[PDB]
């Protein structure tokens, strides 16, 4: 392993919003594949269904569009139409409270799913342990 194995409680039984306390944005995947953050709780593209491939590995799927969150070769997030190597994330507990999502594909490089204070996605190589941008809170829909 390149990472710890502290796992969050809860589960995947229900769909959820992914809230980033950094700037106070909900993760969003627009129909066209664009990934970003919004503070609009009424948005119809911020609801996700998580599922586990293996213990600690998850897919993050848009309930509205069916797209999978994915991180490409350059660390950019995009909505994938199908489940590929780039759609698997290591879900871990962080600071004994939050959830972090590390790209399985690029785990050795410590690339996390994260949002900047202005709501834009932080590129993989620009993220790292210790940042507030990588800290998520799953909220019921």
CATH number, position 101: 2.80.10.50
* Backbone Cα Rg of the chain: 13
Resolution, in Å, please? 2.0
Among 53, 78, 55, which residue's Cα sits nearest to residue 7? 55
For 85, the 3-state DSSP assignment is helix
Altogether, the residues listed in the chain come to a count of 141
Q: Based on the structure, what is the number of domains in the chain?
A: 1
Query: DSSP string covering 1-47, please?
Result: --S-----SS-SSS-EEEEETTTTEEEEE-TTS-EEEE--TT-TT--
Among 32, 27, 19, which residue's Cα sits nearest to residue 81? 32
Distances from the Cα of 84 to the Cαs of 39, 70, 72, 91, 107, in angstroms? Answer: 29, 8, 11, 17, 15
- Method of determination? X-ray
CB 19 within 8 A of CB 139: yes
- State which residues form the domain around 62: 1-141
User: Does 84 carry a binding-site annotation?
Assistant: no
Q: What residues are paired with 93 via a beta bridge?
A: 99
């Amino acid at each position: 392993h390149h990472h710890h194995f502290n796992l969050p409680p809860g589960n995947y039984k229900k769909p959820k919003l992914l809230y980033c306390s950094n700037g106070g944005h909900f993760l969003r995947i627009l129909p066209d594949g664009t990934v970003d953050g919004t503070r609009d709780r009424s948005d119809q593209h911020i609801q996700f269904q998580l599922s586990a491939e293996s213990v600690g590995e998850v897919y993050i799927k848009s309930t509205e569009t069916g797209q999978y969150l994915a991180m490409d070769t350059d660390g950019l997030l995009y909505g994938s139409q199908t489940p590929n190597e780039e759609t698997l994330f290591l879900e871990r507990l962080e600071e004994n409270h939050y959830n972090t999502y590390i790209s399985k594909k690029h785990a050795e490089k410590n690339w996390f799913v994260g949002l900047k204070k202005n709501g834009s996605v932080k590129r993989g190589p620009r993220t790292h342990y210790g940042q507030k941008a990588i800290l998520w809170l799953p909220l019921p829909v």
